[PDB]
Coordinates of N, CA and C and ligand atoms in Angstrom, one line a residue:
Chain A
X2 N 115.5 88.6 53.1 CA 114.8 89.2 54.2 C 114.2 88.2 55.1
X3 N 114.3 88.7 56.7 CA 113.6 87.9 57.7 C 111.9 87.2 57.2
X4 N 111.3 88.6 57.0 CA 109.8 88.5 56.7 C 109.9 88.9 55.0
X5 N 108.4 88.4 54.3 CA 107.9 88.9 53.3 C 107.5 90.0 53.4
X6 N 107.4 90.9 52.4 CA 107.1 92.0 52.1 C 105.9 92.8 52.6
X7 N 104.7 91.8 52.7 CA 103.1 92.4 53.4 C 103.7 92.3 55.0
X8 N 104.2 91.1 55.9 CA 104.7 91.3 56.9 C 105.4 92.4 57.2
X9 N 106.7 92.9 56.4 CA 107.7 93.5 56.5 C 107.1 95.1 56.8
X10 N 106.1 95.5 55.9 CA 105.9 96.8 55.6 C 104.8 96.7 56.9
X11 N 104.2 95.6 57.3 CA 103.5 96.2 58.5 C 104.2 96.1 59.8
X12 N 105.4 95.7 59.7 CA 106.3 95.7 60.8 C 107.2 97.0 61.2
X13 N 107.4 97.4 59.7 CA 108.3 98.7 59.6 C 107.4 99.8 60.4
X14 N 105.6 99.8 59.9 CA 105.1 100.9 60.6 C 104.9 100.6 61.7
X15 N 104.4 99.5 62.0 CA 104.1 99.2 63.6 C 105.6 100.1 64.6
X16 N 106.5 99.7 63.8 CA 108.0 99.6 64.8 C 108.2 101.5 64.6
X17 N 107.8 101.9 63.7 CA 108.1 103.7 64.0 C 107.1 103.9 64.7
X18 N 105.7 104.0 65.0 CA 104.7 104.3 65.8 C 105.2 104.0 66.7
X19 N 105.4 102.8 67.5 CA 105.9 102.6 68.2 C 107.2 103.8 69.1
X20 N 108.1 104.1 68.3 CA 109.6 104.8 68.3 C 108.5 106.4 68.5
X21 N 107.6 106.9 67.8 CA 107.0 108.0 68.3 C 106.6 107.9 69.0
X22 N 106.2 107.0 70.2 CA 105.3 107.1 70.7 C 106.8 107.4 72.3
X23 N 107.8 106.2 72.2 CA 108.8 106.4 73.0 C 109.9 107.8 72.7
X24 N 109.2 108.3 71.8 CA 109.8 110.1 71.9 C 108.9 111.0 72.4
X25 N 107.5 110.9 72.0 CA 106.6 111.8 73.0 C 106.7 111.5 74.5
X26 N 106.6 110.2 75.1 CA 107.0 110.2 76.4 C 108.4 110.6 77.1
X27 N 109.4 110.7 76.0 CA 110.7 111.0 76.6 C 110.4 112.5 76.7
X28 N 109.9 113.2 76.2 CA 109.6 114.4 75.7 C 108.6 115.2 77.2
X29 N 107.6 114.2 76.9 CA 107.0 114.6 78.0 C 107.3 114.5 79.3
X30 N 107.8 113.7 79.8 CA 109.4 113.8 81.4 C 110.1 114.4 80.9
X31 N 110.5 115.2 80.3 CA 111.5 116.5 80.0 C 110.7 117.4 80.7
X32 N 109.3 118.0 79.8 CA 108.0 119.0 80.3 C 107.5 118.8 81.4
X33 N 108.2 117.9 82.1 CA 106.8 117.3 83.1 C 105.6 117.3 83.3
X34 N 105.4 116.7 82.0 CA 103.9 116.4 81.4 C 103.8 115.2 81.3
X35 N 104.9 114.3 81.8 CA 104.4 112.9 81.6 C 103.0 112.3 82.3
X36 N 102.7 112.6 83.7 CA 101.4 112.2 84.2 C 100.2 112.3 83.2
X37 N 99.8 113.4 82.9 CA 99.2 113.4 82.2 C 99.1 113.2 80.6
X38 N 100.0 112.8 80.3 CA 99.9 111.9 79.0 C 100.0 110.6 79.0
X39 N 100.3 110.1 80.1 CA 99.9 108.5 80.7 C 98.9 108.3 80.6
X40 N 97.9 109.7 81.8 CA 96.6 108.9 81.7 C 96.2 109.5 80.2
X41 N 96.2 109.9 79.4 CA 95.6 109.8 78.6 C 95.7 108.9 77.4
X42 N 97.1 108.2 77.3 CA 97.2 107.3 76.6 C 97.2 105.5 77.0
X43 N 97.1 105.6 78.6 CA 96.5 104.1 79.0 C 96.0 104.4 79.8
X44 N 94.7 103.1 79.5 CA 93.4 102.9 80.2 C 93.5 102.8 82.0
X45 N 93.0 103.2 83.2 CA 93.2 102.9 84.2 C 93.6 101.9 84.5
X46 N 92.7 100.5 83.9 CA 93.4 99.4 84.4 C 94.9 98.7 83.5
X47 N 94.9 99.2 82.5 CA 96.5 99.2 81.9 C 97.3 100.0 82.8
X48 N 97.1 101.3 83.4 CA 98.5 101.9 84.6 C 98.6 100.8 85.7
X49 N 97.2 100.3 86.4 CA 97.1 99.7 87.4 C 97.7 97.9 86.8
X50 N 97.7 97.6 86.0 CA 98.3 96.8 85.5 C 100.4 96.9 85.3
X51 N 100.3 98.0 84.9 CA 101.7 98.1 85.0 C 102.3 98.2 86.6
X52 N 101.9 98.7 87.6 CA 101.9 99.2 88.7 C 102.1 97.7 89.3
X53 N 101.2 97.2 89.2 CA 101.4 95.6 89.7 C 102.5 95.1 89.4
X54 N 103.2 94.9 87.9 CA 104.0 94.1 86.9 C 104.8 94.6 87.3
X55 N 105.5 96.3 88.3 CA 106.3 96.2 88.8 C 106.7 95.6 90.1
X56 N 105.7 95.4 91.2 CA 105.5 95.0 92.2 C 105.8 93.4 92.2
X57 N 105.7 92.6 90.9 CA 105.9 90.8 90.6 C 107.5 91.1 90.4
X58 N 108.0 91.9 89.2 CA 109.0 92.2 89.2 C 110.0 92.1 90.4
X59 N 109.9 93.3 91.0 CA 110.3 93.0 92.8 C 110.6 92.0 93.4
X60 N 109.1 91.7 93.6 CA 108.8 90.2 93.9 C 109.8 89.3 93.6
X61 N 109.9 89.0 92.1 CA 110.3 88.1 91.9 C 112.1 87.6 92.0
X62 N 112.8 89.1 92.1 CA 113.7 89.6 92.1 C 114.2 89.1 93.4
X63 N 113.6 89.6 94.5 CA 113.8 89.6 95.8 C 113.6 88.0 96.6
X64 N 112.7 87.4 96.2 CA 112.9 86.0 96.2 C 111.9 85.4 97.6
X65 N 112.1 86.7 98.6 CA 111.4 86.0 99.7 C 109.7 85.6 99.3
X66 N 108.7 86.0 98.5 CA 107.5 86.0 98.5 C 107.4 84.3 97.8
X67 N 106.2 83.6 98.4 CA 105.9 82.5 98.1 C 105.3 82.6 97.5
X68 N 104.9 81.3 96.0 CA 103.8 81.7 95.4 C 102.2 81.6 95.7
X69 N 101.7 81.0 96.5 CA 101.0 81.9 97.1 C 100.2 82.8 97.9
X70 N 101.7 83.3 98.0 CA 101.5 84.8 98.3 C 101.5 85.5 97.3
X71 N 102.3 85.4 96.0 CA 102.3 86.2 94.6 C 100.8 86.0 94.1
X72 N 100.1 85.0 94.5 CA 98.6 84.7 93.8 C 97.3 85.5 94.6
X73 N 98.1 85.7 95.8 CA 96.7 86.2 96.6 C 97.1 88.0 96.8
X74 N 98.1 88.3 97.0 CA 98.7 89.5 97.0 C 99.0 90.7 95.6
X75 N 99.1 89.7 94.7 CA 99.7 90.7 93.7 C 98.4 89.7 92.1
X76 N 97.2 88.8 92.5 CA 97.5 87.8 91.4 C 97.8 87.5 90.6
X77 N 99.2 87.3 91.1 CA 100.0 86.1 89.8 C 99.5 84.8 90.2
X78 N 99.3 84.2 89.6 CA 99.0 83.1 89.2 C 100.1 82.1 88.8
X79 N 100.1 80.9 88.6 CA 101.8 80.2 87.9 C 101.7 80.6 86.7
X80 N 101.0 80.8 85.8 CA 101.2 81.2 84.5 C 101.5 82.5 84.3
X81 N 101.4 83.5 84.8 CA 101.8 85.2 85.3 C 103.0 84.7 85.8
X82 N 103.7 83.9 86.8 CA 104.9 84.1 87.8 C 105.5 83.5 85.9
X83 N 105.2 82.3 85.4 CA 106.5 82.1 84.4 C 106.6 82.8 83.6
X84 N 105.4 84.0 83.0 CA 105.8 84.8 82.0 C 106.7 85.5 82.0
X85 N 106.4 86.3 83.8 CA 107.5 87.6 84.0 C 108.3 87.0 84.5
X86 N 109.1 85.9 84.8 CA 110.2 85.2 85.0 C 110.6 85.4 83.6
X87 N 110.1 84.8 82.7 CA 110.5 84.6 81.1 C 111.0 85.8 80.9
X88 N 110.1 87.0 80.9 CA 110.4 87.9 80.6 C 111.6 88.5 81.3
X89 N 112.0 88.6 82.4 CA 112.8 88.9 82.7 C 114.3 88.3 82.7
X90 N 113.8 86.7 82.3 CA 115.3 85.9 81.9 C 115.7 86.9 80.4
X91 N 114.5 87.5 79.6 CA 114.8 87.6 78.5 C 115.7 89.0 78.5
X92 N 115.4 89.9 79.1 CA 115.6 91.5 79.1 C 117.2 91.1 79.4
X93 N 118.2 92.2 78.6 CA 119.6 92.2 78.6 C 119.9 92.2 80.4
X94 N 121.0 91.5 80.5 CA 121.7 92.2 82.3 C 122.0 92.9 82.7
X95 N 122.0 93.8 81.8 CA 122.6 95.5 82.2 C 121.3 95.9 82.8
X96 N 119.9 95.6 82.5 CA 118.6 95.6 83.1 C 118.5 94.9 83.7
X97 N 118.6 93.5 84.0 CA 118.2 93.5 85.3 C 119.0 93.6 86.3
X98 N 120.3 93.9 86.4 CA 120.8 94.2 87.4 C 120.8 95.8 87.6
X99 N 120.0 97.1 86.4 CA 120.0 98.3 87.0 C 118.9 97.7 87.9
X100 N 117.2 97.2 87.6 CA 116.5 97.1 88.2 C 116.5 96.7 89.9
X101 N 117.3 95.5 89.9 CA 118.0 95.0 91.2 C 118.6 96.8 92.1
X102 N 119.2 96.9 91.5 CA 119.7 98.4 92.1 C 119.0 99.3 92.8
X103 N 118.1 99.9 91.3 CA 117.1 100.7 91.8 C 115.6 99.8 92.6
X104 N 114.7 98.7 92.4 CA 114.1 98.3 93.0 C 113.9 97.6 94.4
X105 N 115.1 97.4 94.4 CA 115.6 96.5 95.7 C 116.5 97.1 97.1
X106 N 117.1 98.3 96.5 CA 117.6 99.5 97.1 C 117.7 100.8 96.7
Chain B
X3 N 80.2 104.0 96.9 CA 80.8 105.2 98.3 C 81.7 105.1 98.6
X4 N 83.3 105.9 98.7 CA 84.3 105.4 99.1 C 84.1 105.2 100.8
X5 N 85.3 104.0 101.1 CA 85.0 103.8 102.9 C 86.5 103.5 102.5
X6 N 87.0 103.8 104.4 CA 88.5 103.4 104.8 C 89.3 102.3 103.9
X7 N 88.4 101.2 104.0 CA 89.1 100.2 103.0 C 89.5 100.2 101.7
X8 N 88.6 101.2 100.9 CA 88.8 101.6 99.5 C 89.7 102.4 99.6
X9 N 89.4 103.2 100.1 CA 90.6 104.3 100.0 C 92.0 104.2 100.4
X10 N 91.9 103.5 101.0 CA 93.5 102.5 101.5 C 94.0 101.7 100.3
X11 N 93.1 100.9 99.2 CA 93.6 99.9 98.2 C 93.7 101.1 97.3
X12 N 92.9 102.0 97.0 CA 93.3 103.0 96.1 C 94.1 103.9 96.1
X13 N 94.3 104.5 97.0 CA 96.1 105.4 97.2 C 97.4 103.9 97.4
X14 N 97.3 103.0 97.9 CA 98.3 101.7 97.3 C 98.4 101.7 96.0
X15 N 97.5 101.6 95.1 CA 97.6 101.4 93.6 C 97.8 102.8 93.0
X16 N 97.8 103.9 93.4 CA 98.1 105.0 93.1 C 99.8 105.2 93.6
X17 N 100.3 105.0 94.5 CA 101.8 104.6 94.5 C 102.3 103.6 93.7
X18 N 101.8 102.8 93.8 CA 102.6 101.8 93.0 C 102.4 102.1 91.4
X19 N 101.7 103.2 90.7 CA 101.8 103.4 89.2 C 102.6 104.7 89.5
X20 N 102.8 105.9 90.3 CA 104.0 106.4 91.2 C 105.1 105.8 90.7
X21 N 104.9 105.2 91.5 CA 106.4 104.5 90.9 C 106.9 103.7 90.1
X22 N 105.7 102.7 88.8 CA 106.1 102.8 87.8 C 106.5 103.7 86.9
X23 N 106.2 104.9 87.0 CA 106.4 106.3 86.9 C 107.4 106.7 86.6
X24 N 108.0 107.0 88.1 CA 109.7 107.0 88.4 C 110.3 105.9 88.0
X25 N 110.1 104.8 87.7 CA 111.6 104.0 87.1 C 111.3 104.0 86.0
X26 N 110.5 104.3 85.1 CA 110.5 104.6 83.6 C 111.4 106.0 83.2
X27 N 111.2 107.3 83.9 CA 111.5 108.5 84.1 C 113.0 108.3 84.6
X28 N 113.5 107.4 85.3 CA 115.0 107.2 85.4 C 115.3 106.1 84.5
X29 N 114.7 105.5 83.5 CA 115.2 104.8 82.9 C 115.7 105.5 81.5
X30 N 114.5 106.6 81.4 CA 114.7 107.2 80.3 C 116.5 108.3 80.4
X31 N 116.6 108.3 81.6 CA 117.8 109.4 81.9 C 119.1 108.3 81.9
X32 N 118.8 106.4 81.8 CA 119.8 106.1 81.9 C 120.2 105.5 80.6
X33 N 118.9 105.4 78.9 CA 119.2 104.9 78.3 C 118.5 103.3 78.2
X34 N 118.1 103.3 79.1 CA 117.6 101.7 79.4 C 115.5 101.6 79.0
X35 N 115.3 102.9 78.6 CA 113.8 103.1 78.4 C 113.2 101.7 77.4
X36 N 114.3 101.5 76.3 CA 113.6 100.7 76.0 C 113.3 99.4 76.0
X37 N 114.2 98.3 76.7 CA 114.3 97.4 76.8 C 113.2 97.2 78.0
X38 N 113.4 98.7 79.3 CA 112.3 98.1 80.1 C 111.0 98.5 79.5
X39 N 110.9 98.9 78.9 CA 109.3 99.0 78.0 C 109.1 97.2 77.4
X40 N 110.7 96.6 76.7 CA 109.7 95.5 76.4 C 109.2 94.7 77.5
X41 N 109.9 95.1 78.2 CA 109.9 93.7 79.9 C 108.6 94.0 80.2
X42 N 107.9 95.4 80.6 CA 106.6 95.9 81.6 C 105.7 95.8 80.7
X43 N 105.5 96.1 78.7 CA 104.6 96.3 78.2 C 104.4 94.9 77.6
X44 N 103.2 94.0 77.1 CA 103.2 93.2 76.0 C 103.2 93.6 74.7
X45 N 104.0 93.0 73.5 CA 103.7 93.3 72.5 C 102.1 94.1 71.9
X46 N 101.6 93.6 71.8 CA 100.4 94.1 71.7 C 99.8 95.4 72.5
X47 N 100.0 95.6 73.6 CA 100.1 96.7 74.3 C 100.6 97.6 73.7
X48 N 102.1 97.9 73.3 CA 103.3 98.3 73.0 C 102.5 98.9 71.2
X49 N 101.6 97.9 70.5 CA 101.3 97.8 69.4 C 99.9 99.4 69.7
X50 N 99.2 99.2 70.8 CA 97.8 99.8 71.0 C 98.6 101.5 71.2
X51 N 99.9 101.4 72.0 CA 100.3 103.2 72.1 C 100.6 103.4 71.2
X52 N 101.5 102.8 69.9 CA 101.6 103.6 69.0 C 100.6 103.3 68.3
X53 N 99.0 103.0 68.2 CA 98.1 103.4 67.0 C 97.5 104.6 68.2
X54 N 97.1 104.3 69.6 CA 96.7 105.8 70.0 C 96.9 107.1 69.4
X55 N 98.6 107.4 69.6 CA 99.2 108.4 69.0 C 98.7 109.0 68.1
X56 N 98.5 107.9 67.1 CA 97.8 108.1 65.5 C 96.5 109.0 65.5
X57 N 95.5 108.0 66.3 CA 94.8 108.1 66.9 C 94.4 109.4 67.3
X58 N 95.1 110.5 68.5 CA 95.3 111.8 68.8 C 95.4 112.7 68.1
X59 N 96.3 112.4 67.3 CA 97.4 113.2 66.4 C 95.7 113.4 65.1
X60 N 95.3 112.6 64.3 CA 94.3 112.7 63.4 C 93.2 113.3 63.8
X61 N 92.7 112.9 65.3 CA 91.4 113.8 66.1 C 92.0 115.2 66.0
X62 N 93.2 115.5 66.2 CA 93.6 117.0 66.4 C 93.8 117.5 65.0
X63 N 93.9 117.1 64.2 CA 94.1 117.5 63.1 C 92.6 117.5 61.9
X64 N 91.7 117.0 62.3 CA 90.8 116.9 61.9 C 90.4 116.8 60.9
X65 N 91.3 116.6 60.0 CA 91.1 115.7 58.1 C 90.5 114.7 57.6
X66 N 90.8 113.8 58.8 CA 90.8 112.6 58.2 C 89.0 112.2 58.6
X67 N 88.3 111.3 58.1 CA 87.2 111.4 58.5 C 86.8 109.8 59.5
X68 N 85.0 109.9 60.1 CA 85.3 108.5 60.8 C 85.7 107.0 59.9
X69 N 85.3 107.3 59.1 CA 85.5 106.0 58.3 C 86.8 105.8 57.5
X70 N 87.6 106.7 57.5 CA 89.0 106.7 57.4 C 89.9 106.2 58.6
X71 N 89.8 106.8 59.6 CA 90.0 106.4 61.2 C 89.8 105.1 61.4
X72 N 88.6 104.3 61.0 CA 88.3 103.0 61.0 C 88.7 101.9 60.1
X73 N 89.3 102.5 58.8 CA 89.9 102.1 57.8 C 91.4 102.1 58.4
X74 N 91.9 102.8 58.5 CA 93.2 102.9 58.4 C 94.1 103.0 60.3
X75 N 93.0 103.3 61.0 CA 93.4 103.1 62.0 C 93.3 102.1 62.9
X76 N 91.6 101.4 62.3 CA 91.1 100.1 63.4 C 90.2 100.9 64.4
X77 N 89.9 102.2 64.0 CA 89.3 103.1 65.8 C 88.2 103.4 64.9
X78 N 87.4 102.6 65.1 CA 85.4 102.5 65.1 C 85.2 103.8 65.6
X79 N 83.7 103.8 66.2 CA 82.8 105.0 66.0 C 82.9 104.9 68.1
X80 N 83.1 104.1 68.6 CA 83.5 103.9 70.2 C 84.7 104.3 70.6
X81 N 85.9 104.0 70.3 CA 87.0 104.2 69.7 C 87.0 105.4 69.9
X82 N 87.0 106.1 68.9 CA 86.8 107.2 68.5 C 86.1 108.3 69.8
X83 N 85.1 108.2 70.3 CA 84.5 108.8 71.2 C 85.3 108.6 72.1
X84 N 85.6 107.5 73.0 CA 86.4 107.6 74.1 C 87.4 108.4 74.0
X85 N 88.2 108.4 72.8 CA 89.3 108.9 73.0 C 89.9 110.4 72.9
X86 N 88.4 111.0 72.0 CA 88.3 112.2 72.0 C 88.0 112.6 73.5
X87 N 87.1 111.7 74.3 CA 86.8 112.1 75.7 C 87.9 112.3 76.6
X88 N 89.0 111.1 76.5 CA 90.2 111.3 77.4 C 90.9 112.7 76.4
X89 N 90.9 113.2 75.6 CA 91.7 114.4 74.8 C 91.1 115.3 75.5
X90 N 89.5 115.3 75.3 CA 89.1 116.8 75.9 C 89.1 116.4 78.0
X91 N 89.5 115.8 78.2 CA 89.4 115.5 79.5 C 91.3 116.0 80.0
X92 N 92.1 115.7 79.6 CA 93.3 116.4 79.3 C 93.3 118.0 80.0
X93 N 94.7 118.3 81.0 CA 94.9 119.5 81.1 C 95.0 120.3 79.9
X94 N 95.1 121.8 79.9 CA 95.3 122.4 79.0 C 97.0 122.7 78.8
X95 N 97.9 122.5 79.6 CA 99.0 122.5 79.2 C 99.6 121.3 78.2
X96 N 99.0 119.9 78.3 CA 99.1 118.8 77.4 C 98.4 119.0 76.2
X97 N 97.0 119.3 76.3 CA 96.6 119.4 75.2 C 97.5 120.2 73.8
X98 N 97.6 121.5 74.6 CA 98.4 123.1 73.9 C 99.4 121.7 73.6
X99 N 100.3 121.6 74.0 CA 102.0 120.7 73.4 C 101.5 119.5 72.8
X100 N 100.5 118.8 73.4 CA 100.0 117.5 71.6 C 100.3 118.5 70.3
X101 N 99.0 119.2 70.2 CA 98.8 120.2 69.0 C 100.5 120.6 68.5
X102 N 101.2 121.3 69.2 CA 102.3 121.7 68.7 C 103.6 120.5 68.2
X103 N 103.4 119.3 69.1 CA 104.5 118.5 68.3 C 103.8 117.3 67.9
X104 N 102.4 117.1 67.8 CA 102.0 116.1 67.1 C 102.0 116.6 65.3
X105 N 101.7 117.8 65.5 CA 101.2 118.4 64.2 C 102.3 119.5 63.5
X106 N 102.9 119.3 64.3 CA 104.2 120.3 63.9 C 104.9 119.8 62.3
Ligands
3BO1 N1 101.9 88.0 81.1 C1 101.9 89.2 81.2 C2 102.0 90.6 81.4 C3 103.3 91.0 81.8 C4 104.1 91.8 81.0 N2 105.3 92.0 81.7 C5 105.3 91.4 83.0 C6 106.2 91.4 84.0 C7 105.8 90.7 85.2 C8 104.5 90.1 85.3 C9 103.7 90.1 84.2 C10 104.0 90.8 83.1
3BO2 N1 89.4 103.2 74.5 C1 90.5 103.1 74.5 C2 92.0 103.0 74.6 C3 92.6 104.4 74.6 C4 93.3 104.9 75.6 N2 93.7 106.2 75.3 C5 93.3 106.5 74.0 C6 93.5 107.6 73.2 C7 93.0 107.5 71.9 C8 92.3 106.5 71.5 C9 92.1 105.4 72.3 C10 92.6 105.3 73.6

């Protein structure tokens, strides 16, 4: 096994919580109840946080914004611009090129 | 007191979670929900919505007691309160469908 057993078994639950939690929201954009179960399950400044993280995203995609302008506009900082770089070198290319798609046009 | 300026940065930030919104909501229709969940959420983050759920799901069910909640969930006596407050703060068409498929 990857992990030992006390690891393992708190990874197993973490990772189904998790998997419920991405079926109630699939569920709720079906009902069109997702708004409201957003705000109720992240804090204002966690939506306003995601809201941003798409706007670096963009950003960073799109190429024209300087850094800073990503630091006074959005702040990222250099240590924010390399994570979501990181992160997005990480994510498969079938994402970032739907993102490019839908974000950019 | 809201003035022009506020209210201009706050309907900004109200589109822009808009439309994190919508590209989660088309992500989910294209199959790609999860991978952009890892990109936009941090681990830890990702770790906080699935104990919420818990979290909901146990307030609505009302079994379990506070010191169980704080045992087994990590959600103290603060915790706890807030979250019952965003529950009862909840339309009533959300609340009615938690109950039904949290506890189903
Ligand atoms: N660091 C950090 C938070 C974070 C998660 N995903 C991101 C994407 C872009 C910028 C920042 C983030
Ligand atoms: N406090 C806090 C975080 C939080 C947001 N939504 C919740 C729902 C239930 C418990 C906790 C939370």
């Amino acid at each position: 096994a990857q992990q030992s057993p006390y690891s393992a078994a708190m990874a197993e639950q973490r990772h189904q919580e998790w998997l419920r939690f991405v079926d109630l929201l699939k569920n709720a954009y079906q009902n069109d109840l997702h708004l409201p179960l957003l705000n109720l399950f992240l804090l204002p400044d966690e939506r306003e946080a995601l809201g941003t993280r798409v706007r670096i995203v963009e950003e960073l995609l799109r190429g024209e914004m300087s850094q800073r302008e990503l630091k006074n506009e959005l702040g990222a900082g250099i240590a924010i611009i390399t994570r979501g770089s990181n992160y997005l070198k990480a994510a498969p290319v079938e994402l970032r090129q739907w993102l490019e798609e839908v974000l950019l046009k």
